[PDB]
Design a protein around this ligand. Structure first.
Ligand code: CYC
Length: 291
């Protein structure tokens, strides 16, 4: 155990900013070796401006999450990074700057438009239909659904927008087991979950033992964390190899999910995930007034 999905890098720093852990794909994306970085200082590995951004963000020890940091190394180029504090470690997760031609970009206009359209929705039903259609425009996903939770944590697909070629899931009910209590808990903490490719080979993080708590590294807060085989099989059975879900939060309660599926592996960068997050906040607020 102790692995992530390969579409990014995970570096784990101790509270003092010393590199204590890393995903095995660091030489393949940066050039530097994993062992040639464990025990190394962040001041040596990152450029002066990057180390400054990191130090400034980590100067408040209460702050659990950080806005995207441009991460540049001394041997560089720039990665888009997210940090989280969990299990007494600072997790720095990097998305490579290498954009694919199939992947969407330029989310601003489409997001402003989505929010303009969403505000004009008259009912809870028509706001969820507009949110599904608008998220599909922003992202390019094949199918986008609004999956609402019932009191027993079972859900129903109350809304959906999709490519004509893909099948419908509108009106379908599923047990609470499909999205279990511990998956649901992490969605109240980190609002967007991504699985760009259900057939990924997990990339391990070495060492997989936390050098402070004694206990192995808890990656339950990492964006790149591995997926339970049960969910991967569930997705494979419906023919969707790329997924993304955005929680609809009513306070800390999970009202539902904005579920996105793609037939082939599909990736939405940090910019588009933050754009979708905003749409979900607008939608949750409107659900609150309309309820
Ligand atoms: C395993 C035996 C049981 C199980 C576990 C499981 N599910 C998830 C995560 C998700 N499950 C879904 C559920 C749906 N997706 C949909 O498209 C539909 C309607 C067609 C449903 C009911 C969702 C949206 C997620 C979130 C992840 C994602 O965006 O795809 C987990 C957590 C996996 C993770 O790492 O996030 C687990 C452990 N699923 C089953 O079916 C079994 C009963």
């Amino acid at each position: 155990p102790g692995a992530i999905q390969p579409h990014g890098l995970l570096l784990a720093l101790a509270a003092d900013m010393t590199i204590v852990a890393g995903s095995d794909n660091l030489p393949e994306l940066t050039g530097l070796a994993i062992g040639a970085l464990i025990g190394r200082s962040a001041a040596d590995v990152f450029d002066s401006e990057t180390h400054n951004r990191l130090t400034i963000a980590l100067a408040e020890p209460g702050a659990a999450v950080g806005a995207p940091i441009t991460v540049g190394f001394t041997m560089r180029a720039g990665f888009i990074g997210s940090w989280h504090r969990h299990d007494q470690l600072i997790f720095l997760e990097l998305e490579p700057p290498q954009r694919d031609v199939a992947e969407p970009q330029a989310f601003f206009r489409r997001t402003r438009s989505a929010i303009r359209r969403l505000q004009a929705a008259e009912t809870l039903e028509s706001a969820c239909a507009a949110a599904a259609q608008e998220v599909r425009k922003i992202t390019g996903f094949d199918r986008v659904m609004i999956y609402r939770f019932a009191s027993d944590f079972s859900g129903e697909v109350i809304a959906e927008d999709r490519c004509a070629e893909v099948e419908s899931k509108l009106g379908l009910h599923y047990p609470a087991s499909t999205v279990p209590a511990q998956a649901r808990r992490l969605y109240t903490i980190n609002p967007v979950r991504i699985i760009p490719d259900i057939n990924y080979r997990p990339v391990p993080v070495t060492p997989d033992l936390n050098p402070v708590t004694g206990r192995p590294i808890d990656l339950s807060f990492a964006i790149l964390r591995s997926v339970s085989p049960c969910h991967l099989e569930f997705m494979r059975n419906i023919g969707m190899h790329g997924t993304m879900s955005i929680s609809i939060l009513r306070g800390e309660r999970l009202w539902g999910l904005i579920v996105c599926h793609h037939r082939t592996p599909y990736y939405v960068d940090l910019d588009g995930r933050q754009a979708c997050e905003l749409v979900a906040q607008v939608l949750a607020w409107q659900i609150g007034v309309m309820e």
